[PDB]
Amino acid sequence: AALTRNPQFQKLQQWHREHGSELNLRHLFDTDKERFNHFSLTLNTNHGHILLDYSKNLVTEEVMHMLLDLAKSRGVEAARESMFNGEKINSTEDRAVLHVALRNRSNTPIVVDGKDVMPEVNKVLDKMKAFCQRVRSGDWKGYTGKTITDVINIGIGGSDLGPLMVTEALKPYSSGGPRVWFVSNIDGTHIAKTLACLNPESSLFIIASKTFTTQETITNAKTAKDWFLLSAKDPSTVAKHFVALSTNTAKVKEFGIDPQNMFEFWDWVGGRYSLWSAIGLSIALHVGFDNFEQLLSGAHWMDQHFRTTPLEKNAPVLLAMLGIWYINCFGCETQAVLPYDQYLHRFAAYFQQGDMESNGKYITKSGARVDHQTGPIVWGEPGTNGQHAFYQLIHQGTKMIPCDFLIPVQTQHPIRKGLHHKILLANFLAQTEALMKGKSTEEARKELQAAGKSPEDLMKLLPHKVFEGNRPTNSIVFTKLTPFILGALIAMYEHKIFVQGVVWDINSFDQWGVELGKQLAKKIEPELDGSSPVTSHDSSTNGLINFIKQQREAKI
Amino acid sequence: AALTRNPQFQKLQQWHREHGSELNLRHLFDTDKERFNHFSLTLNTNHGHILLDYSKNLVTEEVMHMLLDLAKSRGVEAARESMFNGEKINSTEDRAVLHVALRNRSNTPIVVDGKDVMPEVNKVLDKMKAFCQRVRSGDWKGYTGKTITDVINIGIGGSDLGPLMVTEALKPYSSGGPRVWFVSNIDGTHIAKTLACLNPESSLFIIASKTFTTQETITNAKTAKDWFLLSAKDPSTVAKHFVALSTNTAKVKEFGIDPQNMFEFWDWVGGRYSLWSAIGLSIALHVGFDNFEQLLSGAHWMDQHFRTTPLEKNAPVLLAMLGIWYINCFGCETQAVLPYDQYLHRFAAYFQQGDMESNGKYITKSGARVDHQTGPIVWGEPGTNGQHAFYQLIHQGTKMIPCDFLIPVQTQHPIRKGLHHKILLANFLAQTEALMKGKSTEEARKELQAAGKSPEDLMKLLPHKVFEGNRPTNSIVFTKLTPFILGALIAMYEHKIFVQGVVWDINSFDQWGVELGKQLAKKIEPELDGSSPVTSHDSSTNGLINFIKQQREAKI
Numbered sequence A, B: 001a002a003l004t005r006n007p008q009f010q011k012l013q014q015w016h017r018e019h020g021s022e023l024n025l026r027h028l029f030d031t032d033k034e035r036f037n038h039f040s041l042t043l044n045t046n047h048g049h050i051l052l053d054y055s056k057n058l059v060t061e062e063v064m065h066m067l068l069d070l071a072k073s074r075g076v077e078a079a080r081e082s083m084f085n086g087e088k089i090n091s092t093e094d095r096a097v098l099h100v101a102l103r104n105r106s107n108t109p110i111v112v113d114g115k116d117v118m119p120e121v122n123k124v125l126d127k128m129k130a131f132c133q134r135v136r137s138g139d140w141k142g143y144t145g146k147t148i149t150d151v152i153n154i155g156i157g158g159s160d161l162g163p164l165m166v167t168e169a170l171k172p173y174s175s176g177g178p179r180v181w182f183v184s185n186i187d188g189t190h191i192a193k194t195l196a197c198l199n200p201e202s203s204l205f206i207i208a209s210k211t212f213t214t215q216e217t218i219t220n221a222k223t224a225k226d227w228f229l230l231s232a233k234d235p236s237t238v239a240k241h242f243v244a245l246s247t248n249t250a251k252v253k254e255f256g257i258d259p260q261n262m263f264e265f266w267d268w269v270g271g272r273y274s275l276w277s278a279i280g281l282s283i284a285l286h287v288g289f290d291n292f293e294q295l296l297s298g299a300h301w302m303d304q305h306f307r308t309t310p311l312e313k314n315a316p317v318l319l320a321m322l323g324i325w326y327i328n329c330f331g332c333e334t335q336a337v338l339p340y341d342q343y344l345h346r347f348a349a350y351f352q353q354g355d356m357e358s359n360g361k362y363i364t365k366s367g368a369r370v371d372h373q374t375g376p377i378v379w380g381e382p383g384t385n386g387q388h389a390f391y392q393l394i395h396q397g398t399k400m401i402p403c404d405f406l407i408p409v410q411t412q413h414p415i416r417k418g419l420h421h422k423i424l425l426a427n428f429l430a431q432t433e434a435l436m437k438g439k440s441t442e443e444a445r446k447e448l449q450a451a452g453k454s455p456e457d458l459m460k461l462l463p464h465k466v467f468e469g470n471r472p473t474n475s476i477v478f479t480k481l482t483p484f485i486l487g488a489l490i491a492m493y494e495h496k497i498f499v500q501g502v503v504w505d506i507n508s509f510d511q512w513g514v515e516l517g518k519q520l521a522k523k524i525e526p527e528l529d530g531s532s533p534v535t536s537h538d539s540s541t542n543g544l545i546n547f548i549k550q551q552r553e554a555k556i
């Protein structure tokens, strides 16, 4: 594998196995009061500021220089240009990777197969804008002349999570927009519970699917249409209640959706990087097209930052290299994402997909099997809730867990004259301070003695109240969570994921395991029908299938 | 350190040290046709069956024997009886651990440092039922003589996640009950968007706090009362719209809720183990008291299973020891929980707290600092969705990740003649089969060769299409997800967590990390007031605070 054979990686590795064990955050701050200044980055987007404070990390100037030298020797910049220039860096599927083109507000030409893709990107965007206009203004009428009150997005994975997370994060900006619903799981409960609340006369279904063949989505789509026609009664009416977001005109046709009602994207648009495309139709319908264009602009701003800033001051690069540091040097399996914002309740989940589906690989672009760690397990929940739950393990467990704490300075709901947000911010700050500082044995025993504890009680309870600290965190603070800032934040992490993938020399844009999954259920599905036992698989699969058929009858 | 000194543990490590790496699942099955029958257990609860299939784990007869031997030399059984007998096993807090008492429907005596607790346990339960009957029937009236249509639960951590997860899971049994809402985050957005949909006249608030001093809960509670009074008046009417669940009678009164409307629990009721107590009121209110009793009955059955079953066939113990195996011998940092049920969308999140807040510790009950790993990081999202996302990493990443796949045989919504559930079951089965089997280079080669690829391209793509497999999983299948079964499943995991803690000799029932957090931001909160810079903390905390002050009034 490329990484292990790299001299910069070896130098960093040797340094860590020579000093790593010795790096204490509390000590570092106590010996360098310019630390914050030296390990923090402030970005002024002219539409809000974003402060990336990475000073609470187990690093020194020597460590950062070695990490950036690695980014350089691993060719991050050249790879970055290849992506922005439309080169087919997705080597296994031989495709370009152009989500940056989707939000290329500057309209600078990007050539693929001898053709600028921007004209087509803008054509779809204009079509989306015209459609949303019609729907929102009430011009688009259902089969009975009523305006559309509900929009239902049917899709899964990359055709679901992005729009779900963004519409949730941007709720404050959806005034004058129809209600938006997201159905994704094949589990019947999802679509059934959704349909139960809808009126077919005023509901518009959006079938999101790059391929338009995914089993969960097509099956949900058919159930929706069947449900609809139970009222409509004229397939000529579905044209007024069903539209498609896809790249496969053929399939959309077979389903019963004529063009003009198909908003397309392209193969260089990865599913987990597709919310910026026609896939974001539900977003635009929810918050309006101006806000949707703001989202795109925020992403474009971050793309430009990533492309023009020297590595040492490049946000996504710094985030990516600190991650490489914890993953490949400290051996940390996970990465926690902790937004202190309820609207971002699906943010961690979104990047759980974005990061893991991209870098959960073990084969390099040269075909060699990696002999080092790659993508981490990403998780988290919106604080503060976590503090009263899993934070216990982050503070006093046996695992090192790098955490990204995020929060907006200004809230969308300054109720009680800002009291709630004041408390939220204080907790945000105090948590990373405590993770860094911890609480020594002397400090703990002091409190216990002041509490008047007997020598007996203090002795047995003292160890349990000590916090070793030295747990690294990043604090990302932005002025306000607007469509623009959100877009820049999502783009920031997309590029962090990109940089790590380049350093590991893997292809962060294919998903063979996901592709495989879409073809596994195939064989067992028909075998579940009969009531006769199955014996064609290993004994576990057989036993589970037979327990299934047996309990199918059970009358509980 | 205590587990380190155990001979059974040493035996395990030595065996694995030179053998726990050759264990290949596919090989184990292709040499033992009775593997499924020998490595699985079927539990008939009389209200549905539960199949725990742990045959797809990297274990052999020998290994399970050694694992069970370790369980007994560490005193699991002794520790268990101590818990059920009311002994104060929560050493650091010298408190009993009796969530089992809450659902002890056999009413068998459990003397607690004096008198039997059941009489009081059943007293609250009766009071709870009485209250529910009044609210659901229409007896309990709003100050304007209106019937309750919305119930809002306000609490955080253990006073929030349990009732939220259960009411979501048992939604199909909520016919007739009012709508339930859960507010927990101090983030003003949470209470704001919740109250914006309510009508003060027909809304009843439940303030859930064991101590009734938690800043988040108390503050949200005060804000709720405020919202209510600017639509009515006379702080007396509050009595008709606010009730409390706590152990602190007095401080609950100085708020505005007479002890009349207070449903108490006790100190031996851990927050993360409290949904079975008064904390579960929102559950009883949503699905009725008969269903709530079914839930308790379910947990009670599992408790008896755990208490009377020989270790070799004990569900919670088997799950626990398999976990110890992966954590302490294979070094796996995480445990994934993948329910194939939309209703269980908050299930993984529930145990993320239950497990991590319990076993995320590093100090033994003897005061010694652990010499090994403890509590893993728990995470997950419902199936099939994850298959289109993070499963990529489970299948082809560089981390070993034990996964628990769960699914009900019978769906609550058999739409399209069961087509959706048939597809859901097929994926459930196919995914674990695939994680175990993988796809060899040879198999992938033959598929690509047939596909028409040339030596050039086939070679280029081949390694990327190979699945090493040997990914261990547990498949837990139950007849139907009913109140009773949900109760049994939750109790099963509580005991799994209990067993692991004992083996590690830690205290799974205190939370000094969580206790520290509920006092961390207090020093920073006041410093946020004003526009003057702070210099009292480390440069990072100072820097963040100053950036917030500067941006708080920046007009974007």
Ligand SMILES: O=C(NO)[C@@H](O)[C@H](O)[C@H](O)COP(=O)(O)O
Pocket (backbone or CB within 6 Å): A155, A156, A157, A158, A159, A208, A209, A210, A211, A212, A213, A214, A217, A270, A271, A272, A273, A357, A511, A514, B388, B389
């Ligand atoms: O590629 C992926 N993620 O990046 C996957 O998550 C796809 O987005 C998901 O399987 C949906 O595929 P279709 O849009 O073709 O229905």
Ligand SMILES: O=C(NO)[C@@H](O)[C@H](O)[C@H](O)COP(=O)(O)O
Pocket (backbone or CB within 6 Å): A388, A389, B155, B156, B157, B158, B159, B208, B209, B210, B211, B212, B213, B214, B217, B270, B271, B272, B273, B357, B511, B514
């Ligand atoms: O102990 C805990 N979990 O087990 C914590 O998660 C508590 O449940 C949470 O802090 C709420 O405490 P109060 O009910 O006193 O408001």
